[PDB]
Fold:
Amino acid sequence: NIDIFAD
Amino acid sequence: SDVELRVALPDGTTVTVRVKKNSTTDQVYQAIAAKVGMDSTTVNYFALFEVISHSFVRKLAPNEFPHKLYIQNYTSAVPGTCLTIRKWLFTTEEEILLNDNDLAVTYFFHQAVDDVKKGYIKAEEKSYQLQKLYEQRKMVMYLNMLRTCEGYNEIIFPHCACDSRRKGHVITAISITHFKLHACTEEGQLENQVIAFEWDEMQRWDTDEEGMAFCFEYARGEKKPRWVKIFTPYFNYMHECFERVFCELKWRKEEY
Structure:
C-alpha cells in the first residue's frame, strides 16, 4: 500500500 | 420481565430506570430522557454511551441491549455504571440555540468541563479566563467561550493500525469541520504529522466486520479515489460518526 504520510 | 438500569449523567450523578429486559438502546434512551425531563428538542442532542476507558466512551448502536452491557461490566465496587448520557452533536451553532434551555446548558457545561480536564478541548491559552467563569458558575459564558477552542465537538478515538501507514499508528479525530488522522507511535505517543480530510473529499465509506476495520474512500486534489482502512475495534461507532456528520452538513442552517 502507498503511505499517506509519505509526504 | 422488568429490570433496573443505572446510567450516569454529564454532572456525575446517576439515574435508575425500571425497563424491560430486552430493551434496545433507543428504548432505554427514551426511558432515561423522560425520567430526567428532557424536552422534545433536547432529546435529540444526547445519546447513550459505554465507558471504555478513562479517556474513551463509545456510542451504543441501535441493535444493542444496554442491560446486557450493564451486567457484563457490573461489580459491587465501581464509581457506578458503564452506561452514560453524553452529547451527540457536531455543529456548535445548534448548541448555541439552546442557551436558554437550563437542562441542556447544565449538561453541555458539565461535559465540557470534564472534556477540558481530559485534554479533548485545547483551552490552555485562556485557561485562567475560563477558570474564572467556571468558579462563578456563569455557565453560558463559559460555553460561548469554550466553543471557540480547538477540539470542541470533536470525537477522538484510541490509536490503532492503518493500512496506509507502514509503521506507526493513527489517532482519528472527527468533527463537523473535517476528518483528521494523527500520526502517533506504536504506543500512542504523537508524532507531528497529521492529515485533514475535507468531508467533500469523502467519496464513500464502509465497515469490515471480519477484518474489524472502518473503511473510507477519498478523492483529493486531482488523483483517483483511494481506499484507506482503519483497524479500530469501534468501526461501527466510527461509521455512525460519518453518517451523522453528513446528516448535520445537509441541514447546516448557518453560513458561519
User: Anything to note?
Assistant: Chain A touches chain B at residues 1-5, 7 (CB under 8 Å). DSSP finds no helices and no strands in chain A.
